[PDB]
Every structure is written in structure tokens, then in C-alpha cells.
Amino acid sequence: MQIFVKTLTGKTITLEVEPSDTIENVKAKIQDKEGIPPDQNRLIFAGKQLEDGRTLSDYNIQKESTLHLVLRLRGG
């Protein structure tokens, strides 16, 4: 399975995965391949957020899927 991430700065990230992949395996692969750590952003798909213990196909994340991204928040 190939999948895609939509950054704010207009750069499409490409990733190679199994349809079986746990959301953690994808959170790992993105930082080895490119370098997108959690302390700066948060991955979105079809308005829903994506967290651990689940899989790609459970979120209905098909092959060729484009995920959005956001940033992390600001304050104190």
C-alpha cells in the first residue's frame, strides 16, 4: 500500500506501508523516511484524528489515501 500526507507548505509526503499497519508503525516510518515528529504537528484524515492501538484499514484509510496535516497548538 502507498499513502500520502498533505502538509500546509504544499509538499506531498509519500509513504510505503501494509494495509494491516498499526497507526504506531506509520508514526515511526514518517520520522525515519522524512522527519515529521509529534511535538510540531498532528495528522488528520476525513475530518477525524488518528491515534495508537488502531490500524489504517480500521480508520477506512484505503490505498492511495491522502491524509491532511495540521500543526500543533500555541499557548500556556
From Swiss-Prot:
Q: What is the effect of changing residue 68 to G?
A: Loss of DTX3L-mediated polyubiquitination of histone H3 and H4
Residues bearing the modification Phosphoserine: 65
Effect of substituting residue 76 to A = Loss of ADP-ribosylation. Impairs ubiquitination by CRL2(KLHDC3) E3 ligase complex. No effect on ubiquitination by CRL2(KLHDC10) E3 ligase complex
Q: What is the effect of changing residue 44 to D?
A: Impairs ubiquitination by CRL2(KLHDC3) E3 ligase complex. Impairs ubiquitination by CRL2(KLHDC3) E3 ligase complex
Ubiquitin-like domain location is 1-76
Q: Where is the cross-link described as Glycyl lysine isopeptide (Lys-Gly) (interchain with G-Cter in ubiquitin)?
A: 6, 11, 27, 29, 33, 48, 63
Q: Where is this site: Essential for function?
A: 68
Glycyl lysine isopeptide (Gly-Lys) (interchain with K-? in acceptor proteins) cross-link, chain position(s) = 76
Q: Which residues form the signal peptide?
A: none
Q: Which residues are marked as site: Interacts with activating enzyme?
A: 54, 72
Membrane topology per record: Peripheral membrane protein
Q: What is the effect of changing residue 72 to G?
A: No effect on ADP-ribosylation
**What transmembrane ranges does the database entry give?**
none
Q: Where in the cell is it found?
A: Cytoplasm; Nucleus; Mitochondrion outer membrane
Please list the residues that carry the modification ADP-ribosylglycine: 76
Question: (Microbial infection) ADP-ribosylthreonine modification sites?
Answer: 66
Q: How is it modified after translation?
A: Phosphorylated at Ser-65 by PINK1 during mitophagy. Phosphorylated ubiquitin specifically binds and activates parkin (PRKN), triggering mitophagy. Phosphorylation does not affect E1-mediated E2 charging of ubiquitin but affects discharging of E2 enzymes to form polyubiquitin chains. It also affects deubiquitination by deubiquitinase enzymes such as USP30.
Q: Which domain of life is it from?
A: Eukaryota
Q: What does this protein do?
A: Exists either covalently attached to another protein, or free (unanchored). When covalently bound, it is conjugated to target proteins via an isopeptide bond either as a monomer (monoubiquitin), a polymer linked via different Lys residues of the ubiquitin (polyubiquitin chains) or a linear polymer linked via the initiator Met of the ubiquitin (linear polyubiquitin chains).
Name by which UniProt lists this protein: Ubiquitin
Q: What species is given as this protein's source?
A: Homo sapiens
The full protein's residues present here are: 1 to 76 of 685
